[PDB]
Amino acid sequence: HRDEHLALVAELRSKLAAAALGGPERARERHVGRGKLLPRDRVDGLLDPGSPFLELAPLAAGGMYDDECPGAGMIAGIGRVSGRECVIVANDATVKGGTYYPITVKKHLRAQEIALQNKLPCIYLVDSGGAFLPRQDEVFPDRDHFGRIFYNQATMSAQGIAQIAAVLGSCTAGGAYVPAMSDEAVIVRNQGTIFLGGPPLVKAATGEVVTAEELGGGDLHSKTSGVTDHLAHDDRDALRIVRNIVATLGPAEPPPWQVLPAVDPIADQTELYDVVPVDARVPYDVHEVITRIVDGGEFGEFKAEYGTTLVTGFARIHGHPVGIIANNGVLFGESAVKGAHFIELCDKRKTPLLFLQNISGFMVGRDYEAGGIAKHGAKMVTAVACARVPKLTVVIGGSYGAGNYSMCGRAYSPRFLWMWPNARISVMGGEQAASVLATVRGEMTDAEAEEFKAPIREQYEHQGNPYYSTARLWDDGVIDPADTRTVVGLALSVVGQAPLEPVSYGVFRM
Amino acid sequence: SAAGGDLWRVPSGWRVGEWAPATFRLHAGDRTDHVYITGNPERASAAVEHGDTHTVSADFTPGSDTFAVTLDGLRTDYRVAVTDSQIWLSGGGRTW
Amino acid sequence: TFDTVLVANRGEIAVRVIRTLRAMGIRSVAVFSEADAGARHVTEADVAVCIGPAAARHSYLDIDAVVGAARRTDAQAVHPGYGFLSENAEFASALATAGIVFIGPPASAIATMGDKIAAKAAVSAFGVPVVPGFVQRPRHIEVQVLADGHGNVIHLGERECSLQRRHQKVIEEAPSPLLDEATRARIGAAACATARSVDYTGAGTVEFIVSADRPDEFFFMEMNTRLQVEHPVTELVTGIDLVEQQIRIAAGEPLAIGQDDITLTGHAVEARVYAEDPAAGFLPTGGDVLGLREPTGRGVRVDSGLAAGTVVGSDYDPMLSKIIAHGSDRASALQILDRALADTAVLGVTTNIEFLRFLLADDDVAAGRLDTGLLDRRAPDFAPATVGDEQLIAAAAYLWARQWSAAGGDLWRVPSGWRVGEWAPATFRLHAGDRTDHVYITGNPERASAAVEHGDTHTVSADFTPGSDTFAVTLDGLRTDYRVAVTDSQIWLSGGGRTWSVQKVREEPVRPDDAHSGDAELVSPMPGSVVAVGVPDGSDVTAGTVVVTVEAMKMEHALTAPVDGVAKILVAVGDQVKVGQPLARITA
Numbered sequence A: 001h002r003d004e005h006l007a008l009v010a011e012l013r014s015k016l017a018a019a020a021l022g023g024p025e026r027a028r029e030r031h032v033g034r035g036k037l038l039p040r041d042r043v044d045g046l047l048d049p050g051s052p053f054l055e056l057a058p059l060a061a062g063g064m065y066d067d068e069c070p071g072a073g074m075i076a077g078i079g080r081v082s083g084r085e086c087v088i089v090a091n092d093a094t095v096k097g098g099t100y101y102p103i104t105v106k107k108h109l110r111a112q113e114i115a116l117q118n119k120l121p122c123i124y125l126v127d128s129g130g131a132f133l134p135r136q137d138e139v140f141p142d143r144d145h146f147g148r149i150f151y152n153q154a155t156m157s158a159q160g161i162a163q164i165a166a167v168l169g170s171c172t173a174g175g176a177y178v179p180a181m182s183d184e185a186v187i188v189r190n191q192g193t194i195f196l197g198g199p200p201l202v203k204a205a206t207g208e209v210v211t212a213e214e215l216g217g218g219d220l221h222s223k224t225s226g227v228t229d230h231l232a233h234d235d236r237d238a239l240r241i242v243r244n245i246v247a248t249l250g251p252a253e254p255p256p257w258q259v260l261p262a263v264d265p266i267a268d269q270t271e272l273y274d275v276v277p278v279d280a281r282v283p284y285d286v287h288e289v290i291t292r293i294v295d296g297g298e299f300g301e302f303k304a305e306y307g308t309t310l311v312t313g314f315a316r317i318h319g320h321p322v323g324i325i326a327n328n329g330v331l332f333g334e335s336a337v338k339g340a341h342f343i344e345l346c347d348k349r350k351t352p353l354l355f356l357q358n359i360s361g362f363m364v365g366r367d368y369e370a371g372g373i374a375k376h377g378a379k380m381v382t383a384v385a386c387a388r389v390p391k392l393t394v395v396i397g398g399s400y401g402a403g404n405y406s407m408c409g410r411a412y413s414p415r416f417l418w419m420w421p422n423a424r425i426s427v428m429g430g431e432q433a434a435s436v437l438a439t440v441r442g443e444m445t446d447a448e449a450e451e452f453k454a455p456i457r458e459q460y461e462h463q464g465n466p467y468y469s470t471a472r473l474w475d476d477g478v479i480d481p482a483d484t485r486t487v488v489g490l491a492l493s494v495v496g497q498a499p500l501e502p503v504s505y506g507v508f509r510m
Numbered sequence B: 001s002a003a004g005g006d007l008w009r010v011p012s013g014w015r016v017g018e019w020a021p022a023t024f025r026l027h028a029g030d031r032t033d034h035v036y037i038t039g040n041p042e043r044a045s046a047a048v049e050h051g052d053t054h055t056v057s058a059d060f061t062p063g064s065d066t067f068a069v070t071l072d073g074l075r076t077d078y079r080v081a082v083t084d085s086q087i088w089l090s091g092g093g094r095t096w
Numbered sequence C: 001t002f003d004t005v006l007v008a009n010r011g012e013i014a015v016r017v018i019r020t021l022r023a024m025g026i027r028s029v030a031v032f033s034e035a036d037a038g039a040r041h042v043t044e045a046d047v048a049v050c051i052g053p054a055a056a057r058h059s060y061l062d063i064d065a066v067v068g069a070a071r072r073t074d075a076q077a078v079h080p081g082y083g084f085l086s087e088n089a090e091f092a093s094a095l096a097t098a099g100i101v102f103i104g105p106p107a108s109a110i111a112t113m114g115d116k117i118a119a120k121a122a123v124s125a126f127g128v129p130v131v132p133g134f135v136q137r138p139r140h141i142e143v144q145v146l147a148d149g150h151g152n153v154i155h156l157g158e159r160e161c162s163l164q165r166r167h168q169k170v171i172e173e174a175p176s177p178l179l180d181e182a183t184r185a186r187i188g189a190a191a192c193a194t195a196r197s198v199d200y201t202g203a204g205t206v207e208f209i210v211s212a213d214r215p216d217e218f219f220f221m222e223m224n225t226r227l228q229v230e231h232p233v234t235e236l237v238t239g240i241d242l243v244e245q246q247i248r249i250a251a252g253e254p255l256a257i258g259q260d261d262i263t264l265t266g267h268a269v270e271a272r273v274y275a276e277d278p279a280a281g282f283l284p285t286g287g288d289v290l291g292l293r294e295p296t297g298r299g300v301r302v303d304s305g306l307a308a309g310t311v312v313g314s315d316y317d318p319m320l321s322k323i324i325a326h327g328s329d330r331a332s333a334l335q336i337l338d339r340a341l342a343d344t345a346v347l348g349v350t351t352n353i354e355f356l357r358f359l360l361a362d363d364d365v366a367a368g369r370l371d372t373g374l375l376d377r378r379a380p381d382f383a384p385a386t387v388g389d390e391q392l393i394a395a396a397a398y399l400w401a402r403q404w405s406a407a408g409g410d411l412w413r414v415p416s417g418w419r420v421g422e423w424a425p426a427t428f429r430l431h432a433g434d435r436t437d438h439v440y441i442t443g444n445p446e447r448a449s450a451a452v453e454h455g456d457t458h459t460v461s462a463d464f465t466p467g468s469d470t471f472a473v474t475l476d477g478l479r480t481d482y483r484v485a486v487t488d489s490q491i492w493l494s495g496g497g498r499t500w501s502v503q504k505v506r507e508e509p510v511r512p513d514d515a516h517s518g519d520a521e522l523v524s525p526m527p528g529s530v531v532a533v534g535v536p537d538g539s540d541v542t543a544g545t546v547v548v549t550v551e552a553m554k555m556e557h558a559l560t561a562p563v564d565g566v567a568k569i570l571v572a573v574g575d576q577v578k579v580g581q582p583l584a585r586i587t588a
């Protein structure tokens, strides 16, 4: 299967490289020509030397907005700044002047959600022209629209999660609350401008003509209004000041579990290209994945002989303990009660959960419904929803229907979720949808059946594709399979930084 | 070496996409230039601003006074001393 | 003399040359393959060039790579050592083309002596004895010639190299015990004639065959146009640094010595420490050198490529080091060599040193009834020394004392085995050689008792120091001090004149398997139908074999035989099957 995975990963890396450039070269040239750093160089210049950077949804809005909005005009992710992992959100001013599209709002809110759930300091590198007015009804007014950004700043600030802003360019309308709501705001002299109403509105309302520097320039706010707390000479000076601010926050909390010295895996991670079929119709043993990603290949399987279409067991990844839960076929009732029992063990042992999804669904038929497969699935869903340990999800194959819910899909707030580029996600598989609808059509000629099925397959292939998923932030990114061990390892260091709530479950339908 | 294998401390420059080179701006004599290093100390590549791209391997021992660099296959062993601000090297018949 | 010399070789000979270059004051350049990047010689030289990947054909044999390194470093001459391009005329021609002095004989000599048909024609024209065409009980004898471009030729002495395993030389001597002072003068003059036959210059060695019955009846066999591995025994008996002279000759100086400056102050013997296991039939072996001790007695010399943390691999000749003893007589030199090999300890790699010691204790070797078949006849009766209780107890006591020290006095961590009643012995199951046994230790490291399964009960005291390379055990009052090294899994010990490893091994299961453990059953993972059978019923198959394919939910579940065995098939194509339905049994 290696060549198919290599082609999918080459496509992924080509898309990542294209999105990383941001706007057109004319806009990049004009940005640098004004003496600015490029948004990605702002992010890289903020990190500690050589720090990893776990970018959130780099292919957001891919294939949306006519592809005029690479990465949704935003760079978001986790990097180490002054010795702490921080969530960095930066407006890509080269993409449409940093305009917030609906996906830009969603990406910003997801970065704040990661920061809230993991207690990470937030750094906002603000440089945005405002809302995309043609779709303002999708940028404004709902609960998860642009106003929620400031609700997130305030409540995180109430918890003592530091909110830090650097105003590196325009900051206008409601966006003026990103600096003003932050605990400590930096502004670059003769670049950053903050105002609730800009020059065009001042002119339309009062007839007065003002520049954006006269109205709300960095000198005005740092000397007279007090909206800002530090005045920086340039972008590099702003990043230096932000690093000094972060150095005042003190350390992160130690993990609630024991971390051991990491042990290398027994295999080169590109061996994952050999053992996992790209075609979801080809069965394989998921132990071939597990023993390659875990430290030393050590995996203590729980209930190995029972419910064998679900694999559950304890391992370490980069020294962090994990309870791995992985699909290995169709879910049976036995598999769901196995999963629920294992989640209860991990919850009491304070062990974070790793879900490896490749699930078509539950076993169908009269004897399974009579056996109460829905009640056993509900017990697993209850355990997943109520588990107090961190949950991480990697979709390595199919992710369909109630199997998605039983395996900690996005609705269950896994602390992070990623897709492999071979994955698919939809309420059904494409062939299931085509077969069920053809069964409702009844008898038809094979040449008529194929003509009936082709639009259904096309729909579910188009909507189920990983880039369609990531474009909409249904996941935090498509990742190369061979990076899975690194990504989970990085995430395991992040999710240990929040304290655990006590164990508490809803009523298990016994 | 000081990172001790802690992924967030290791200066890998890891990215989902193309990895970032570890970047140093260094002044020596009358030359100030960036060095960009990619890979890992067992097998790396270093590129210098206004300069060429070289293969690098670097053999660091904690607390040692000697450090070895294989540069395009030429192994040279340097005495090293470091302050808060300067790196003093001596090897290959040079000291700087 | 040259200002920079390249040493186009590896290992013990590279170190040997670099040492002389450093004493002469010449800047020394090494070369290494990627497999030797941690080798000693790259650290002993002043600078080193990676010449290529591990394979010799892509490193030390790659003429363009070695000459490229010589060019890059401004090496003015190349010393080739031996065993690689030291007798390659293409290399010497490429160096001459590069303007770099090959330290050695002319390409015409190398080309002439490289074929015995041509060599015999060249040699016989100078009147040197040549074999008519077999010899009873042959003795390998060889003469070290040294020659310069000014027409001086000298013989430094002869050697005996007849102790050979499958023509692999193992132990060598200078002088030979065979010859007397009258006939060795003839052999020396004849060797000088073989050198003058081909305008030879530098060091070279002439191989003669002699019948054990007729010491005075030589025949020419070979001319080797290089320094030999054996050269140190001559270097010891003469006091002439053959490498220094070979350099000075290549630098164009005269010999600056005469036949009246040659002398033989005693007898010298050497043995080759090889990474080969004689109990496993001399199979080449390797691994990390976890720790090293090399002898430094009076009249002992060690020439070695080893350092702690070096890796031994199969890419090259398994030669590791040479132990050389020089004494007043053959028996004294053999005693000094035996004492040295008793001190030589390589941890992490199994070596022939015990086989060398066995040969050095053979009556034929001690009395000197050598012949080129002797070792091949003697080796089938070598056996390794039994794993005594001491060899298990010393490892058990090391593991136990290490654990006791690491506990730091914390009662729950101290391996005391404390009980309200009789205390539990600290129990180790240890494998060494062909012996697996338990050691039971009671007491404390200062005063303990150890009992071995199938063995005796011994008093033990164990003196462990954190981070020390040495550990001492007083066993029934006999104090022995061991060099010790430990991995995740093996303990390597050297002391009391022997070296071994011990493995800590799992307990045996208390219940042995029934033969049913060789059998297996294949069951359908899904309800579906059998769409293919890949194996005829009741047939032998291997664990790679697809036996039955079930289709369910449009997925082909091809089930693979988990074991080699007779596969019996329980279903036919088109059969509907249930979850867990046996589809085949496979039996041992």
Ligand SMILES: *C(=O)CCCC[C@@H]1SC[C@@H]2NC(=O)N[C@@H]21
Residues within 6 Å of the ligand: A330, A360, A361, A362, A363, A364, A401, A431, A432, A433, A435, A436, C553, C554
């Ligand atoms: C063929 O096109 C139908 C495939 C879908 C049915 C199977 S049944 C068992 C799995 N559970 C589910 O919901 N779909 C899968």
